[PDB]
Design a protein around this ligand. Sequence first.
Ligand SMILES: CC(=O)Nc1cccc(CN)c1
Ligand SMILES: CC(=O)Nc1cccc(CN)c1
Lengths: 12, 321
Amino acid sequence: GRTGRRQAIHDI
Amino acid sequence: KKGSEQESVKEFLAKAKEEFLKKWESPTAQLDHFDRIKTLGTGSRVMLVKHKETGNHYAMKILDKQKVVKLQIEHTLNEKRILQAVNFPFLVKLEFSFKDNSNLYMVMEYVPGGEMFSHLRRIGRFSEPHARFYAAQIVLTFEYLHSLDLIYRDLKPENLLIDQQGYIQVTDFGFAKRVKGRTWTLCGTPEYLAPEIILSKGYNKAVDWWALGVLIYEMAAGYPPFFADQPIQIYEKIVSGKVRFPSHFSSDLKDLLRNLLQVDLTKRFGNLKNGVNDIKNHKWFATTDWIAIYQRKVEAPFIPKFKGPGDTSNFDDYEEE
Ligand SMILES: CC(=O)Nc1cccc(CN)c1
Ligand SMILES: CC(=O)Nc1cccc(CN)c1
């Protein structure tokens, strides 16, 4: 799994 | 006694809604008023700045109009309008906002303790009492926001700053929205999305309660419950209705998390007849003095070190543009 900072998603 | 406590919450929320509505219906500075110091965070940036006149430090969020090209635009207006109208101990305070030909700017109080994210990844996980202290603040913040029909929609440790008392400051209202019933935008962060968002269903404030379940799990485990290298694998895990727990989780914690990370909205805590009280009165929170947390009377599990005004030592480094 992703251990670094996670980017939000703005559409699909 | 619990009856008195419930009446007092009702009273506080009615007064909070009156104050919010005054500011919501009737909502400056300029860039050369600040020295830019250092980038504190960046995404699809926030800089430490120093106000030239007063010498006060602030966190300035800079939004490039050339990047906010997606139909992004509504969300930016949501963020500014909401932040100027709310008032709660665990919400970051907006101080100034302005715009120029290139950018929009929101200038907020600087919270120098760094992101919960950094501290959690460094120590690995938090013990349950430590995690509970942070979770209690989020519970109260969402009780406040939801009472105003605001959904937050981006809870995660990256967005929770630790202040000089060791308490949380919620930042980044970029997806927060006033929603009287349901809303439909697909948005958030993959590991923290409720199943109904992924499934393209209209949804309501219960997605924030699901996300509290993810956050409590991640704080207490050191990793989130739906964990994979690619977003599509994460989404398959979220919608399955399966969660496994570390062997060190208490049974009270697992019980609370099974009720937050509940795919069935007729069963999810925070979404039932008793609302937030199914969470506040859960056994895992039995030691929590809700009013003492709100009044910041509880000693925090740790206090970040600070060398003085403008100290950025608790933040990671970023490329400067
Ligand atoms: C003066 C004042 O604000 N009293 C108040 C308000 C709301 C509810 C109750 C009921 N205990 C009392
Ligand atoms: C107001 C403020 O300081 N915001 C901030 C700082 C650093 C990082 C992030 C990104 N979650 C946000």
